[PDB]
C-alpha cells in the first residue's frame, strides 16, 4: 500500500486557504498588480542607467547603440514580466500543493482545477484477477 500515501495529509481544524480557489485568485491577481508596477519601475531604472552609462564613456570605448541596447533591454523586461507572471500563476494554481503537509497530493492536483475527491468519478483498476491484487487495490483506493 505504498500508493496509499498519495493521499497523505494532516488537516488542521480548518482547511488550508489554498484549497479555496478564490483565495488563490486574490493572491494571484495581487501578485499580478505587484508585478505590473515592477514592470514600470524597471523601465525607470533601465532608463536612468541608459543615460548613466553615457557619462561613464571614454572616447576610446566603443559607442552604445541605444536603439540596440534599449531594444534588448525592454524586450527583456517584457519577457521577465511574463516570466514573473506565469511564475506566480505556477505557485497559485499549478504547484500550490507542492510538499504541503496539509494537502494530499490528490487533493492538490484535483483542487487546482476546482475539484474535490467527490468529482473523481471512475477508478480504473489494475485488477489482474489474482487473489490478492484485487483486495489490495480496492483497499488502497478506498482508504485513499
Amino acid at each position: 500500500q505504498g500508493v496509499l500515501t498519495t493521499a497523505r495529509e494532516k488537516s488542521g481544524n480548518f482547511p488550508s486557504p489554498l484549497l479555496d480557489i478564490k483565495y488563490r485568485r486574490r493572491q494571484l491577481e495581487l501578485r499580478r498588480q505587484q508585478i505590473k508596477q515592477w514592470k514600470e519601475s524597471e523601465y525607470l531604472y533601465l532608463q536612468e542607467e541608459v543615460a548613466a552609462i553615457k557619462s561613464q564613456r571614454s572616447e576610446e570605448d566603443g559607442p552604445f547603440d541605444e536603439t540596440a541596447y534599449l531594444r534588448e533591454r525592454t524586450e527583456h523586461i517584457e519577457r521577465e514580466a511574463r516570466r514573473q507572471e506565469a511564475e506566480a500563476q505556477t505557485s497559485f494554481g499549478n504547484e500550490f500543493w507542492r510538499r504541503d503537509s496539509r494537502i494530499a497530493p490528490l487533493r492538490g492536483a484535483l483542487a487546482t482545477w476546482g475539484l474535490t475527491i467527490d468529482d473523481l468519478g471512475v477508478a480504473s483498476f489494475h485488477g489482474t484477477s489474482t487473489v490478492a491484487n484485487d483486495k489490495n487495490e480496492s483497499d488502497v483506493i478506498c482508504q485513499q
Partner: protein, 49 residues
C-alpha cells in the same frame, strides 16, 4: 531477472520507504540517466533523499 528487482531488494532490506521508484535502462549510460532521474524527481517534491 527484472532490472528493478535490485532496487526492490534494497527497499525490502534497508529503506522501508514509500518513496518513488523510477528505475532506468539507458544501457552504457544508465548510471548518469539515473542521476538525472533522481535529480528531477527530487526537484518536483516527489522525494528529498
Amino acid at each position: 531477472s527484472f532490472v528493478n528487482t535490485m532496487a526492490a531488494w534494497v527497499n525490502m532490506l534497508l529503506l522501508s520507504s514509500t518513496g518513488p521508484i523510477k528505475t532506468p535502462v539507458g544501457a552504457c549510460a544508465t548510471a548518469v540517466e539515473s542521476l538525472d532521474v533522481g535529480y528531477d524527481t527530487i526537484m518536483q517534491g516527489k522525494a528529498r533523499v
